[model samples]
Target: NRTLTREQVLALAEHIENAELNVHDIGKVTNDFPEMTFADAYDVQWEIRRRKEARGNKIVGLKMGLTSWAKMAQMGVETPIYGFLADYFSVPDGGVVDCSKLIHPKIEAEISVVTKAPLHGPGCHLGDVIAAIDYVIPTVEVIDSRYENFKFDPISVVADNASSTRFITGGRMASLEEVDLRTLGVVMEKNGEVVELGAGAAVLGHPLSSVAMLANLLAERGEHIPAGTFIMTGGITAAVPVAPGDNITVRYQGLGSVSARFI
Candidate 1:
């Protein structure tokens, strides 16, 4: 039962997306519309995606969030959420990120998958996701919430596109048969000091599991993960706040490493 009308969804989508585009912050949309449902939140998100596409930004991929127990506990949410990735949000490995374009950015270590086959749900399982996988690569996701003080309810977060911002993909790409994803480890280094570390198991016990969950979630909207889609599974470590002049490198076991500098 979606609570927002189409006009309301459009208005909220513009409200939230403009905050992102203009590098500002606002209160959660739910502050005004307390009756918003998850369905309505997604409606706002899709509308934001439409607005971006209409303005010439390519929808590059999809990403999952709050897949870890720590992340869920931190956000006080029990279920994972997702957002679309835009081409402009991608920063090259070893590249520089301009701090002027974001508001209170945070970084997370993640494993991303590129699919060779389409995955539809209703019953999407780990096996299905694994079978569809083309390869997995290491990535660092830079998340910046448009809400004030980086705080928001789950519905509002969804409506804000799960705080989608920037991403950096590097390291080697390996097929599922070549590695034990559950045990694949990553160490995040900020300014040459290890700040966070974890294994793929931190993401729903297996990073691929998040993709399965994403497929199931997308099925709710009559959508599916198409072939050639790049999907960021989820954050393996808790997000670490970043600032200008901070350099970050995430070393992944068996997958090489990715690095970036904030300026």
Candidate 2:
């Protein structure tokens, strides 16, 4: 059974706002909750998402986490985890993020999209995913774990939206056919130094597959991720931390380049 009271659960969600000070600006999961027999995190997420929807915030898109095969292998898991994104969570290109309230923040390069229509259901395939997209942009997701010490089990990560905090987008947009997403490139450079690298292929060989999986997952919840929702497919590589004065550059071939200046 879950140890947290409804009040405790609600307070934990409130604690997120009190701490992040981003009542509508961020997503967080508890970091130190004990593990039990059944899944405890997914419910918290639903409550959070439901309340967001209640407050006139539309659920914009879903984010895929832990999709890297190597990370999956290392963690001894096979499937991916999905999380909801609110419109407020997105920052315009060249936006600024205050550094004081975050913990152990890591940034990664990724591709984000605004869907043209709704997508949910089984039998979803790559072609179906390609048809659903409206536009794609180069994106950087800032993941900051709130748990003390940044130490967490799989459940903690899931509850925390996989440590999702802030994300910035570069204006570079692409058509599904214009670029080979299966092998698209992503590079992260911090403080004028190259920090990490990978490819779109790192996320299940193609990011669209992640969306396909998302459709099915949402359908199970009796919802469809409508088009125009900006979905961050998955991280092209592992995330690296940043601070004031860091310049984060994310690049994808053919799709062009975009960046953030941490000030």
Candidate 3:
């Protein structure tokens, strides 16, 4: 039921890019294109990525969002969304994130995978992802939605690249042979207080399954997870909002932890 043209969607993507650069929020795109389908949503997201790449940024990785049931429910959608990560979005394990450059920043605990072999889909399963994974690590994702009031429709958020802003990966890494990701636990603290806690199972039963899902999703678009790609499986717990001056840390059961501060 979507009626937006390719050029129209491209213009919307530019609008979103502007919002990000200006550090301001605009109304959801769905407010105007109520019938925008998931296909149209991803098209807009790709356009945004294309715009960034055209301006000299490199696409370093991809991220899966809303892999958990709670995340989907909170976003009022049933299916998860995916977003691309640019090299500029990478922060050191214990880095400082400037709040002044972001709209409204929130943080989430996550599990990440660095793939060694290219992952293709249509038939790609967990076994494929497991075999492709080079290492498993702890990560923290900083999501900054470019929408007013931190709210938007599923389509709009997808178009906005699933609120992906920045991420920090733990320095330590482990092979899949060293741990069973399903039962792995995660604890996130904000400003010295425990704010969110969860297990790896919270991410689509198994975090790697999220990777498999991403492969299949990409296959539908004739794309695949490339070798050496860094993928953030998804948030293990609901995102916790943060302000400048607040410190956040997430500890993963077997893997080491990652921390960051907002300034």
User: Which has the greatest lDDT?
Assistant: 1
State residue 231's C-alpha deviation in candidate 3, in Å. Answer: 0.5
How do the residues 134-174 of candidate 2 rate in per-residue lDDT, one tens digit apiece?
A: 77878888877666555555665565556666788875686
RMSD, one per candidate, in order: 1.0, 3.4, 1.4
Q: Over all chains combined, what TM-score does candidate 1 have?
A: 0.98
Model 2 ranges with Cα > 4 A deviation: 1-12, 15-19, 22-39, 54-58
User: Which residue pairs show collisions in model 1?
Assistant: none
Compared with the true structure, all predictions reach lDDT values of 0.93, 0.71, 0.88
- Candidate 3 on 137-239: residue-level lDDT in tens? 7888999999999768888988999999898887468887787889888999889988899998989999999999999989878999999999999988888
Best by TM-score: 1
**TM-scores, one per candidate:** 0.98, 0.85, 0.96
Give the per-residue Cα lDDT of candidate 2 at 133: 84
Give the Å shift of residue 251 in candidate 3. 1.4
Q: Per-residue alpha-carbon lDDT of model 1 for 43-120, expressed as tens digits?
A: 999999999999999999999998978778877877799999999999999999999999999999999999999999
lDDT minimum window of 10 residues, candidate 2: 22-31
Candidate 3 Cα misplacement greater than 4 A, ranges: 74-76
Question: What residue runs in model 1 are displaced by over 4 Å at the alpha carbon?
Answer: 73-76
Which model, 2 or 3, shows the larger lDDT?
Answer: 3
